[model samples]
Structure formats: structure tokens, C-alpha cells
Target chain A: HMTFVALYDYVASGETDLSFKKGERLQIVGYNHGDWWLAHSLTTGRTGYIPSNYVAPSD
Target chain B: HMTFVALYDYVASGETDLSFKKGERLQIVGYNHGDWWLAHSLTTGRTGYIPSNYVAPSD
Candidate 1:
């Protein structure tokens, strides 16, 4: 589950953004949204934008 | 599972947006992003922005 894992619970942060919790592994689809990025959430069965820095990369 | 759901596979769609598939039940965090809105995908375990009209409301 290391495609891109969430390191923190960053929910309800922005309007044009996504929300998440701890230990969430997501897929980074597009990372050109300036400060945010598009991702697929494995925990919520949905996809949205999230804080780019809140995610951790795999080995 | 009716907070907010996805009606289609919306992957690889936006830069500061989210991605999801059919049958994805997501949560709408904020809806003031004009063209896009904030949501939480129960499919991917991450949060981000998404097209405001791509999701369906509950009954």
C-alpha cells in the first residue's frame, strides 16, 4: 500500500480539496494543481484533491 | 453510505481535483470552490478536489 501513503489526517482543509485520515494509501494521478494534487483514495472508495505534502512516497 | 457517492469513474481528470470510480461513496467537505468542490473519497483513502457535478446526492 505504498503507491502513495497518507501520513496525516488532513480533512476539511480546503474547499477545492479532498479530505483524509491517518494511514491512508492513495494514488497520485495529477500533481500540477499548484499546492494540491489529484488522488484516488483507497480508504474512502472515492477520488479527490489533497494536500501534496501530506502524502508519503514508497521505497 | 450516502454522504456523497460517485456515479462514474472519474480518474485522471484534474490537477487539483479528485478521482473516483462507479459506486464510490464520498463525503462532501466543502462546496464553495465554484467549478470544483472539496470531498473525501471512500474508495482511495485520500482527500482532494473534484468536479462538483460528478457526484450524486443521497435520497
Candidate 2:
């Protein structure tokens, strides 16, 4: 589970379970070591990894 | 097709034609107009639009 995987902190819980529209800027926290998971915004059913430190909050 | 599209410049041409592994930081150019298309990195068949100037080249 923690081996070779990533983690992230969200502004709100259960946010990942909902629909994130296309081009929604999201802040990805706890990406210091490159371990995290990200679901697709356009296709809610799709999921993948975005580098932990690569993304920032949508200001 | 010409209405509401996006465009991006690559470090090298033909780079998008191959498999882009997960977490690859890609500089998204020509986003000033936010009219372009972007293919997916993890899912080769998947593609979407990232905010113009949201990304920078990976140094």
C-alpha cells in the first residue's frame, strides 16, 4: 500500500469521489517524494498519477 | 474544430507521438488563447486540455 505509491492531502474530503470538471485547478499536497494518485477530471472513471510536487492550487 | 481549441509547442517535434510515461512535466505553450488539444500521458488514448501557461518545461 505504502510501497512505491503516493499520497496527497485535499482541501475537502470525498472530493476525489465527485466530479472535477475539465481544467479545474487543484492543489496537490504532500508530493515531496513523488507518491500520489489522481483521478481524471473529465472522465471521472479514469485515474492515474500526477507527480506529487508537480501541481499547485488553482488560485 | 477551429472554435474553442488549444495549442502547445514541444521541446521536440514527434515527442507526443510516443508513450509519455506518468508524471512527465510538459511545458504547455500557446495557451494564451486556450484553444488547443492535449493527449493523455498515462492513457495514450486519453486526451484533454490543461490551462494555458499552467505548466512549464521540465528542466
Candidate 3:
């Protein structure tokens, strides 16, 4: 029901990791597929697979 | 060596549509992922699962 913002700059490394800069935001698009988070960026705009630890939910 | 860039902004429209923007660059990570084109974004850095038709190889 809320949005997520990047805690820091995350560069995409391997295996479906969605990269983002610090302060970027995303909406949780769906549940994790095999433990990876599915996100749709409300910042630069993308719906991709990303790591869960790099972001924090905004209030 | 080569990479794939988006021809247009392709939003996530279905289950796992890995969204992207126009001219965003991505590296083709794998094919044969049971039929989906697995790509890692070089722009924002997402190893996204995207559609093959929405992108073109960069020169």
C-alpha cells in the first residue's frame, strides 16, 4: 500500500538484480519469485527483479 | 560485447514483464530460460526478464 525508496546506490550485478540510485523509489509490483523481490520503479520507471535488502519502505 | 537497448518504454503488463524505458541499455544474460529472454540492464542494472521484440541490439 506504500512505496519503497533506495537506501543507497545499487548497481546491477548478476541474475536479475535491478539496479538503482540512492533516493530512487519503487512500488512493490508482486511477491518474490524464488526469494527475489519484484519491483516497479516509480523513479526511473521499471518493473524488474531486484534485491530486497537495498530498499526501505517510505511512510 | 554487444548489448540490447529498449526501442520504446515497455511497461510490465503481465506476470513478470520486466519493465524498461526507451533507449535504456541491457545485456542479454540468457535465452532458453524456458522461453523468456533474460537480460541484465546496463543502464539501471537490472537482470530483467524482458520481451525480445521490444529491444534491439546496439551497434
Candidate 4:
């Protein structure tokens, strides 16, 4: 479900946890090889791996 | 200030407030000439202006 959304708190994926504001841009990098694992990054300047269900793309 | 950001709440600009979710994309429209006014919109499907101090870019 790719729905546009914002970050209400800080999330740690892999490496460093991406810190964002209540009104920050989130871009889903993509999912892992073949697992439920997903990838995401902040539009500002942070990238990491996350779950596919943790994000909601804008409409 | 043009920075990548998300929406924490429903903000009204010139018209209907562009509704957004937690973890959405935000694009800065621009700023009003000779003024502190700023323009912003959701990457989803909305456009409007806001105060320059209302947004913060990810780092």
C-alpha cells in the first residue's frame, strides 16, 4: 500500500535511525531481495532499510 | 525555506488544507517575493503556501 504519509517519530531501520519531523518527506527506496523486508529513506538526506508495512505513500 | 518535510496536521493555505498522512512527501512550492510567506504542498496531490518557519528538512 503506497500511500503518501509523514513521520510522527524517529525510526531505526538498519545503520542509523532516520530522524524526521512531523511534516517531513519519506521516500520508499524499495523492498529487500525476496523478503517482507523493505527499504526507505528521508527525502531530506537519510536512507535505510525498513519494513514494507511501515510506510504509506501519499494519495 | 525550501526543505523536504511532512505534514503534522491539517494546514489551511489559500483553500482546502491538503490532507496528509504520517510519513508522506512534501514539496515546497516557493516563497512570496518581498515577504516571509512560503508555499508548500504534498507530493500526493495538493498545493499551498505556508510560513517559512513551519517546515523542517530531514538530515
Fnat: each model in turn: 0.17, 0.00, 0.08, 0.17
Worst 10 residues of 2 chain A by lDDT: A11-20
Runs in model 3 lying further than 4 Å from the true structure: A14-35, B1-59
Highest lDDT scorer: 1
Predicted structure 2, TM vs. truth: 0.19
Candidate 3 per-residue lDDT over residues A1-59, each given as its tens digit: 45666655554433442333332222222223222345566656655554444556664
Better of 1 and 2 by TM-score: 1
List the global CA lDDT of all models: 0.48, 0.28, 0.45, 0.35
Second chain TM-score, each model? 0.51, 0.27, 0.53, 0.35
DockQ of each: 0.11, 0.04, 0.08, 0.09
Docking class of 4: incorrect
lDDT string for model 3 (B1-59, tens) is: 44655665654433453444332322222223222344555566445445444556664
lDDT of 2: 0.28
Q: Candidate 1 versus the native: TM-score?
A: 0.33
Lowest lDDT 10-mer window, candidate 4 chain B?
A: B29-38
Where model 2 places Cα greater than 4 Å from the true spot, the runs are A1-33, A42-46, B1-59
List RMSD in Å for every model shown. 15.8, 15.5, 15.3, 16.7
**Taking the tens digit of each residue's C-alpha lDDT, what string does model 1 give over B1-59?**
33556654455333444543333333433334334444556567566665545555643
